[PDB]
From Swiss-Prot, chain A:
Gene3D superfamilies cross-referenced by the UniProt entry: Nucleic acid-binding proteins (2.40.50.140)
Protein name, per record: RecQ-mediated genome instability protein 2
Known DNA-binding region: 28-98
Disease: A homozygous deletion of RMI2 has been found in a family with a Bloom-like syndrome and is probable responsible for the phenotype. Patients manifest depigmented skin lesions, multiple cafe-au-lait macules, and growth deficiency. Cells from affected individuals show a high rate of sister chromatid exchange and increased chromosomal breaks.
Signal peptide as annotated in the record: none
Cysteine-cysteine disulfides: none
Similarity field: Belongs to the RMI2 family.
Alphabetized UniProt keyword annotations: Acetylation, DNA replication, DNA-binding, Nucleus, Phosphoprotein
Swiss-Prot record, chain B:
Subunit text: Component of the RMI complex, containing at least TOP3A, RMI1 and RMI2. The RMI complex interacts with BLM. Directly interacts with RMI2 and TOP3A. May bind DHJ. Interacts (via N-terminal region) with BLM; the interaction is direct.
Name under which the protein is recorded: RecQ-mediated genome instability protein 1
Family: Belongs to the RMI1 family.
Role: Essential component of the RMI complex, a complex that plays an important role in the processing of homologous recombination intermediates to limit DNA crossover formation in cells. Promotes TOP3A binding to double Holliday junctions (DHJ) and hence stimulates TOP3A-mediated dissolution. Required for BLM phosphorylation during mitosis. Within the BLM complex, required for BLM and TOP3A stability.
Signal peptide extent: none
UniProt subcellular location: Nucleus
Native source species: Homo sapiens
Amino acid sequence: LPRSPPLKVLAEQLRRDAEGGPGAWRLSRAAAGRGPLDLAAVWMQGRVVMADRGEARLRDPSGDFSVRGLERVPRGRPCLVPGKYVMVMGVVQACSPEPCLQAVKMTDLSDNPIHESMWELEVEDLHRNIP
Amino acid sequence: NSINLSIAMDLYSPPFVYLSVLMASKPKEVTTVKVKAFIVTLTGNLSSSGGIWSITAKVSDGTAYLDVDFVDEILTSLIGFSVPEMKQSKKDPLQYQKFLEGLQKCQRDLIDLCCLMTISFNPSLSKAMVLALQDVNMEHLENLKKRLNK
């Protein structure tokens, strides 16, 4: 339902460059030499650090982020277990001091180690191709 | 008889490209590209009309949303039963049980799908058909690093 597509982002981008608020987040991109990137929903990936029903804390190479509302997502291969590498599609509820997402979906990506080895490059590649 | 050479890498560059870029190029004819995407949600029932499996879903590669059609072969593979095989499975409780197990497996596979998909996009109709799925591999990782490291 997000009106913004699920933008791929690392925890540091929300933590450090996100602006605005609740109904309107914008990612500053001054360094690139581009204007603000509006976002509502995001695609994020990371290792499950801890999981307590409906909630979890994940960690990507740039930092941690938490996810809530997991009792409502589609039931695929179960992965709400410390150590699992997963992806989450979620609506941004907070960005600093720690990004927080309302989960739309959480998928297990532990099987193929390529996903984790490629995530940072994917985020860099996608952002390089956005006006 | 014309190809906008200035977007060749935008549409074909290895390992995958982006939906937003494809749409921004305003394609005039059927265009086939490869994107890394997952399914946001199913948008309709699994149909068996025509004697084949088909279902529509909404996917995303992180830059846009796109409605796609899964038709025939990919679904037969995920479920493990073709339509006629399912119809035959009905006269035997245990074979039908296997079909139901295959139906649920297909349900979970689409929920967990996150791979490279080759899609045939028809601009004149506003959606695509999935032609193939492929797990990300080392080759893709190397291609991504190459278009970004040197």
